[PDB]
């Protein structure tokens, strides 16, 4: 399971600015914090994890101070870099920690400037990853001067993140291990080339994310199956469709087999 706090900050000009954050634990949303809201909102009942009411307020207040502090720090940094860098500016942040068995963790804090990954917090300081421009050496020098924030970020990544996620995984064990049965349906679309036809196998409403969808001639599996990308549903379930370019006549005597954890042993087979 990978826990991540995704922040998206937009600075249109010297005055206008907004920062919105979304927090995830695997493929499930746990928190949301829009620029309009003065407090971090829970999207799951177990979003507070194993933290006490007093422990959460202390944590939320740190973020509340950070959000205001961050907005000004970027505004001043743009002043410090002018005319080299100017608005519109879009700064993204991806901070969290991936959990491993046997009390093992690996924490990250990645910063992206205008869609490109440029800065990261590593060890005891801010650092520019390879590929990043050299002008960022001055903002990093200034950001590394502030020892107070460095000690806070160090504590947050090394201790606060793994301890919170451990409890979060304990509290949300039921929702993460939840099983949803997939409903499959067949359809056909005539392809661009004269002769062949694309046969689609629409699979929807399955959870967890790993699934097996393939086109079968009966018992022999077809190598020409093209499984698409995972598309999300509103009710936190998944959608996936697998295509197969079959010639007009090969359509009959073909089925779609779907194997998922929720189904158990009996796989969903739909004959054309």
């Amino acid at each position, epitope marked *: 399971y990978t826990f991540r706090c995704l922040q998206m900050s937009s600075f249109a000009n010297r005055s206008w600015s907004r920062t919105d954050s979304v927090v995830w634990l695997g493929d499930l949303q746990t928190h949301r914090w829009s620029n309009d809201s003065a407090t971090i909102s829970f999207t799951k009942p177990w979003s507070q994890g194993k933290l006490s009411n007093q422990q959460w307020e202390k944590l939320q207040h740190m973020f509340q101070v950070y959000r205001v502090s961050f907005t000004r720090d970027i505004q001043e940094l743009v*002043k410090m870099m002018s005319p080299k860098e100017d608005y519109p500016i879009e700064i993204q942040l991806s901070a969290g920690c991936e959990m491993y068995p046997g009390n093992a963790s690996e924490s990250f804090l990645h910063v992206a400037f205008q869609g490109k990954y440029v800065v990261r917090f590593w060890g005891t300081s801010w650092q520019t990853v390879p590929g990043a421009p050299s002008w960022l050496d001055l903002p990093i020098k*200034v950001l590394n001067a502030d020892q107070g924030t460095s000690a806070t970020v160090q504590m947050l990544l090394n201790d606060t993140c793994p301890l919170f996620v451990r409890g979060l995984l304990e509290a949300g064990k039921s929702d993460l291990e939840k099983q949803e049965k997939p409903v499959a349906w067949l359809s056909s679309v005539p392809s661009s080339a004269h002769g062949h036809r694309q046969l689609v196998c629409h699979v929807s409403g399955f959870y967890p994310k790993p699934v097996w969808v393939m086109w079968m001639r009966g018992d022999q599996e077809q190598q020409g199956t093209h499984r698409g990308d995972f598309l999300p549903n509103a009710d936190e379930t998944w959608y996936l469709q697998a295509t197969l370019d079959v010639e007009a006549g090969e359509e009959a005597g073909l089925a779609c087999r779907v194997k998922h954890s929720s189904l158990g042993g009996q796989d969903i087979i739909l004959y054309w």
Partner: T-cell receptor
Amino acid sequence: AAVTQSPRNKVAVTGGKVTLSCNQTNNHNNMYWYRQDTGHGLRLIHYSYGAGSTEKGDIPDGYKASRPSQENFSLILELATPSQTSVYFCASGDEGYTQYFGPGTRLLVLE
Amino acid sequence: TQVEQSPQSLVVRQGENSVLQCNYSVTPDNHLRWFKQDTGKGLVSLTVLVDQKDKTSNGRYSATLDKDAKHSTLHITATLLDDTATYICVVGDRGSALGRLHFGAGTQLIVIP
């Protein structure tokens, strides 16, 4: 880390042009202009993050800043008003929070 | 308005100790500086407090900082005639150059020789 201010005292007339200069040989990128008045603390007028840069402070109205080089930062009063009778302080600093202050400049604007 | 010092002014006799207060509503509170300013002269830094619960000393000057209470005190043990000056409290909202300095009006000390 020493910061010098010229002049140390100035007597100007209303409508006249006043220029308060500040020199720093500490190779500091950032420089700040403040004014001290009885009943108030030091209030930021203008500040510069480097040569060419000039940024508005908390009370900029009536004052124009100029950073021609890393060494010098000037506070220009295009049209002097008697309300600009104050003790003006200059400061400089690197990436750190410490601002190294100048000795001060007393300015009097007479009618 | 964000940084306030008490008392506004005070008169002490030579050898007596003087205690000066500072209360601030500044957010965030990185460091606190105590300045000594002689009549007409410039700003001389006395001490800097940086921790959540800090206690610093420099000769006769000693200061304490309580970041949770957002309060600071300056004790001048056995005041001398040359201690007659204005004492200014300063709060910095960042640990880097990005910070703004929030100054107090000052406490005027008069020492009777």
